[PDB]
Design an enzyme around this catalytic site. Structure first.
Site, short mmCIF file in Angstrom:
data_model
loop_
_atom_site.label_atom_id
_atom_site.label_comp_id
_atom_site.label_asym_id
_atom_site.label_seq_id
_atom_site.Cartn_x
_atom_site.Cartn_y
_atom_site.Cartn_z
NE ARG A 1 10.21 4.58 -5.87
CZ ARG A 1 11.24 3.69 -5.90
NH1 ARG A 1 12.50 4.19 -6.46
NH2 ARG A 1 11.34 2.47 -5.38
CB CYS B 1 7.78 6.12 -3.23
SG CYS B 1 6.33 6.76 -4.15
CD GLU C 1 -0.28 4.99 1.44
OE1 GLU C 1 0.44 5.91 2.01
OE2 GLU C 1 -0.73 5.26 0.35
CD1 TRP D 1 -3.25 7.43 -6.27
CD2 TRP D 1 -2.87 9.52 -7.30
NE1 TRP D 1 -2.35 7.21 -7.25
CE2 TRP D 1 -2.35 8.34 -7.93
CE3 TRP D 1 -2.65 10.71 -7.83
CZ2 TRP D 1 -1.72 8.46 -9.29
CZ3 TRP D 1 -1.85 10.96 -8.98
CH2 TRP D 1 -1.52 9.77 -9.84
C1 HEM Z 1 0.76 9.53 -6.75
C2 HEM Z 1 0.61 8.60 -5.87
C3 HEM Z 1 1.57 7.79 -4.85
C4 HEM Z 1 1.30 6.80 -4.38
C5 HEM Z 1 0.11 5.71 -4.57
C6 HEM Z 1 2.41 6.61 -3.33
C7 HEM Z 1 2.58 5.59 -2.48
C8 HEM Z 1 3.38 5.31 -1.43
C9 HEM Z 1 3.18 4.54 -0.24
C10 HEM Z 1 2.05 3.47 -0.01
C11 HEM Z 1 4.11 4.78 0.58
C12 HEM Z 1 4.37 4.10 1.94
C13 HEM Z 1 3.44 5.07 2.78
C14 HEM Z 1 3.75 4.66 4.23
O1 HEM Z 1 3.45 3.45 4.55
O2 HEM Z 1 3.81 5.37 5.21
C15 HEM Z 1 4.88 5.84 -0.10
C16 HEM Z 1 6.04 6.32 0.55
C17 HEM Z 1 6.71 7.31 0.04
N1 HEM Z 1 6.03 8.33 -1.32
FE1 HEM Z 1 5.10 7.83 -2.41
N2 HEM Z 1 3.14 7.85 -3.30
C18 HEM Z 1 2.66 8.64 -4.43
C19 HEM Z 1 3.05 9.75 -4.51
C20 HEM Z 1 4.16 10.25 -4.00
C21 HEM Z 1 4.98 11.63 -4.29
C22 HEM Z 1 4.17 12.63 -5.49
C23 HEM Z 1 6.13 12.03 -3.63
C24 HEM Z 1 6.89 12.87 -3.68
C25 HEM Z 1 6.84 14.08 -4.38
C26 HEM Z 1 6.26 10.50 -2.89
C27 HEM Z 1 7.34 10.21 -2.15
C28 HEM Z 1 7.22 9.22 -1.13
C29 HEM Z 1 8.37 9.11 -0.17
C30 HEM Z 1 9.56 10.01 0.02
C31 HEM Z 1 8.06 7.99 0.46
C32 HEM Z 1 8.73 7.41 1.69
C33 HEM Z 1 9.25 8.24 2.91
C34 HEM Z 1 9.75 7.50 3.54
O3 HEM Z 1 11.11 7.03 3.29
O4 HEM Z 1 9.25 7.27 4.76
N3 HEM Z 1 5.13 9.64 -3.30
N4 HEM Z 1 4.53 6.16 -1.25
C1 LIG Z 2 2.82 11.68 -1.09
C2 LIG Z 2 2.23 10.20 -0.54
C3 LIG Z 2 1.24 9.21 -0.98
C4 LIG Z 2 0.74 8.31 -0.38
N1 LIG Z 2 -0.10 7.59 -1.19
N2 LIG Z 2 1.25 8.04 0.88
C5 LIG Z 2 2.15 9.03 1.67
C6 LIG Z 2 2.39 8.60 2.68
C7 LIG Z 2 2.51 8.76 3.83
C8 LIG Z 2 2.87 8.70 5.33
N3 LIG Z 2 4.07 8.26 5.98
C9 LIG Z 2 4.83 9.27 6.53
C10 LIG Z 2 6.08 8.83 5.63
F1 LIG Z 2 6.83 8.11 6.43
F2 LIG Z 2 6.59 9.89 5.11
C11 LIG Z 2 5.05 8.11 4.84
C12 LIG Z 2 2.45 9.94 0.86
#
Ligand code: HEM
Ligand SMILES: Cc1cc(N)nc(C#CCN2CC(F)(F)C2)c1
Ligand code: HEM
Ligand SMILES: C[C@H](O)[C@H](O)[C@H]1CNc2nc(N)[nH]c(=O)c2N1
Ligand SMILES: C[C@H](O)[C@H](O)[C@H]1CNc2nc(N)[nH]c(=O)c2N1
Ligand SMILES: Cc1cc(N)nc(C#CCN2CC(F)(F)C2)c1
Ligand SMILES: [Zn+2]
Lengths: 413, 420
Positions: B121, B118, B295, B290
């Site tokens: 974070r 992520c 993405e 958000w």
């Molecule tokens: C607040 C704004 C956030 C942004 C800008 C952000 C950004 C991102 C992005 C760009 C990805 C990759 C998505 C993809 O390529 O499919 C990602 C993955 C992820 N985000 Fe964040 N995220 C945010 C919030 C959160 C929150 C609130 C959570 C959990 C409470 C979270 C948990 C995760 C997890 C678990 C993954 C990866 C899942 C995996 O292993 O495939 N994110 N995030």
């Molecule tokens: C919380 C959050 C924020 C963000 N900006 N993006 C994502 C995403 C996504 C979609 N793919 C499926 C996955 F493998 F879980 C990540 C999630």
């Protein structure tokens, strides 16, 4: 054991058996992955025996003579030399094969579909820096081939006691100088400021311009390195212009046609070839993204965007992104207009996937370093981005080595 | 190993990692092979199968409570020792245990903090947690999800939230959101053989139609929710359209761009992942934040197996599409992502570009090494899918390891669910 890699764009699944034959570490552990570490991590008689046997076994397997009378004689012979001389000498056939498979095994190289069309120049009879310069000029002239570039490697004598290494002190055969000014700015290539300084100290008289081809700094047989100027008619260069922006040529940008890495170590059957410059041709992003647009390099994004009248007030305008594409168009168009071999990142990644599939089919896998294979721009619109890859280390291999000025004990008082 | 350094090759800053000494489960890699680019490298789970035995679940529970009470400056305090004995008795009697509110909130925030993949974070401690552990029906789950969407959308000023439904018990009573995200568009197989809408969702779309959903068969049909509670058959619900914030995509210079008729939704809300705390498994835990513009602008719009809009945009741009070396793909790619960012920002919908976001994560890494001694990060996922080397994270070495609490993948429920 088998391992599967999946392409998430095509759903093709390949099956890697080759990884069972790797032996040095990746740097990873069972509980930490170090896949984005740039650099993680002389042999005795007892060490050299199994390494040499491993390579002689695999050579004779490749030529479908495993177990043959010749295979067994060779092993016996290699073993005598290690007993006698504490080292051994490769046959020419072995050298060529080892050099090709070091390339074939280079997990970070996207151009490996060409691995078996490598021109191996055997320079193990070289004894002086003058000799090395002669060998390197011939390499450059052959490889350059008036713009129709050809893959080539020149292999100098192997390491012996560590006190008589051959080394090319340059990181590449052709690179531009960098000079730091008193005001803190940098003229030329900021990556090469240190090597430029060593050159100037050794006696190089620099013209102090933006694109000074550096001198060769050549070390034979553990002696102090010596300076040589590549004959300028051997350094093929491309002035960078743009098919749409007439103003682009006014940036005064140019680049050299021949990418020739000269600071790595070739390891074959336990032997270490510490000077082994090798060359192919450029993928455009290497120049247009890394060389031109890295903040620590020529750093021309702000300049180019300026002349595009992009809004540089906020990052979310993506002015850097926009300027990066145009620069990379200009690179590819410039080389192509001058009929100098170059490959764009889309063609190169597409070919690497075909190569990888063929390698799984005929060899049981293809070690690949995703972090390096994916181009530095437009990652996910290239096929390799969606390709799962196993990274493991096979030998013969190319390896990094210490910069020679951090190790060399200077001779002349 | 004793302590591991990472270096940034643009700034030469070196960070020293000790947090990895708390890594629990395998990465997939070995000394001899690296699986850094495998999507699901490892099946190493901390508890087995269904209801674990006491020697299986208590040690995990004891670990998380130990970590939680250390986090709040106890360990060994009365509360800590009472809580252990309490979880001990509870497992002895119900084969599970229940988390305190505080432990739940701590656990969710740290699952986000530990999510190596992520980039966002830096926000991890600013996470609204909706306890939905009293839910019992898919109607109840629908109510909870609607509140989540509404709180999180917040009329464009998006807020991060997670809603945590009841944990797994025997594995036959799971709560699942069958949707991969709370809001996605349908994908329809066309009679010729092409695809209308989002090809990723063709299968889930078919399940919905098979379950009685009436497809409008448009390019951007918001999908119904398919909610499963206490192991029962899943149930369809239409999210109220006034709760689904959408942004029409226009370009700040190309006036023709609006006529591509593209939109996207504002809230990315992942709903198919599993939240693991103290050995407890929350199979339904939709979370949301958000978007990073890439993405939508790179992956959603331009993947070949997604909306695949590059050639149509390039056409309108009058680009040389004969040969790849004209970089027409790359050029359209930039313009689309300018359009997405421009559109979200024009409608005051929270969005962050990949430059700001990667910079934020460099700051977050630095923070985490200062205070925590490390920060697990997956370089393959962190680096944006466009303009990689001009964002600071490309040049940043990262160490990847698995810390708990975590979010995990889990099987798609239709592969494993015996219908009734
Ligand atoms: C607040 C704004 C956030 C942004 C800008 C952000 C950004 C991102 C992005 C760009 C990805 C990759 C998505 C993809 O390529 O499919 C990602 C993955 C992820 N985000 Fe964040 N995220 C945010 C919030 C959160 C929150 C609130 C959570 C959990 C409470 C979270 C948990 C995760 C997890 C678990 C993954 C990866 C899942 C995996 O292993 O495939 N994110 N995030
Ligand atoms: C919380 C959050 C924020 C963000 N900006 N993006 C994502 C995403 C996504 C979609 N793919 C499926 C996955 F493998 F879980 C990540 C999630
Ligand atoms: C024939 C055309 C070739 C192309 C298009 C090509 C392409 C590339 C590119 C783009 C890189 C990454 C460079 C960087 O990011 O700095 C690379 C790395 C590499 N190439 Fe190739 N290459 C070619 C030929 C060769 C040859 C002839 C050899 C050796 C005989 C070779 C060995 C390597 C090695 C060892 C690396 C990685 C260096 C490392 O581990 O850091 N390549 N290649
Ligand atoms: C094969 C490869 O690991 C796979 O395509 C990954 C690469 N990096 C990624 N990075 C992000 N953010 N999201 C992804 O889906 C992927 N996919
Ligand atoms: C820190 C990171 O490993 C480093 O910047 C790598 C990333 N991937 C790369 N990939 C290539 N081809 N060349 C590089 O120099 C790098 N640098
Ligand atoms: C043979 C070759 C072909 C090519 N197209 N590019 C390169 C390169 C390079 C420079 N970097 C330093 C490295 F790590 F060795 C790679 C090398
Ligand atoms: Zn690894």
């Amino acid at each position: 054991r088998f391992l599967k890699v999946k392409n998430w764009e095509t759903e093709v699944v390949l099956t890697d058996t080759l990884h069972l034959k790797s032996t040095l570490e990746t740097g990873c552990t069972e509980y930490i992955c170090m896949g984005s570490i740039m650099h993680p991590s002389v042999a005795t008689k007892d060490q050299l025996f199994p390494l040499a046997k491993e390579f002689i076994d695999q050579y004779y397997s490749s030529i479908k003579r495993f177990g043959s009378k010749a295979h067994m004689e060779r092993l016996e012979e290699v073993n005598k030399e290690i007993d006698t001389t504490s080292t051994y000498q490769l046959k020419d056939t072995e050298l060529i094969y080892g050099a090709k498979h070091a390339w074939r095994n280079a997990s970070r190289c996207v151009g490996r579909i060409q691995w078996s069309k490598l021109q191996v120049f055997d320079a193990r009879d070289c004894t002086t820096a003058h000799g090395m310069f002669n060998y390197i000029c011939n390499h450059v002239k052959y490889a350059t081939n008036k713009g129709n570039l050809r893959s080539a490697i020149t292999i100098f004598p192997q390491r012996t006691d560590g006190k008589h290494d051959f080394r090319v002190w340059n990181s590449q055969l052709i690179r531009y100088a960098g000079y730091k000014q008193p005001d803190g700015s940098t003229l030329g290539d900021p990556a090469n400021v240190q090597f430029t300084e060593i050159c100037i100290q050794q006696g190089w008289k620099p013209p102090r311009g933006r694109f000074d081809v550096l001198p060769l700094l050549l070390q034979a047989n553990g002696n102090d390195p010596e300076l040589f100027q590549i004959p300028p008619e051997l350094v093929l260069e491309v002035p960078i212009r743009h098919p749409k922006f007439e103003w682009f040529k006014d940036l005064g940008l140019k680049w050299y046609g021949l990418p020739a890495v000269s600071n790595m170590l070739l390891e074959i059957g336990g032997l270490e070839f510490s000077a082994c410059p090798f060359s192919g041709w450029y993928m455009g992003t290497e120049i247009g993204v890394r060389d031109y647009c890295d903040n620590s390099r020529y750093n021309i994004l702000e300049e180019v965007a300026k002349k595009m009248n992009l809004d540089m007030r906020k990052t979310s305008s993506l002015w850097k992104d926009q300027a990066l594409v145009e620069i990379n168009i200009a690179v590819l168009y410039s080389f192509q207009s001058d009929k100098v071999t170059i490959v764009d990142h889309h063609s190169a990644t597409e070919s690497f996937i075909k190569h990888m599939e063929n390698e799984y089919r005929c060899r049981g896998g293809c070690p690949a370093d995703w972090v390096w294979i994916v181009p530095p721009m437009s990652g996910s619109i290239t096929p390799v981005f969606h390709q799962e890859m196993l990274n493991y280390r096979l030998t013969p291999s190319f390896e990094y080595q210490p910069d020679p000025w951090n190790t060399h004990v200077w001779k002349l008082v």
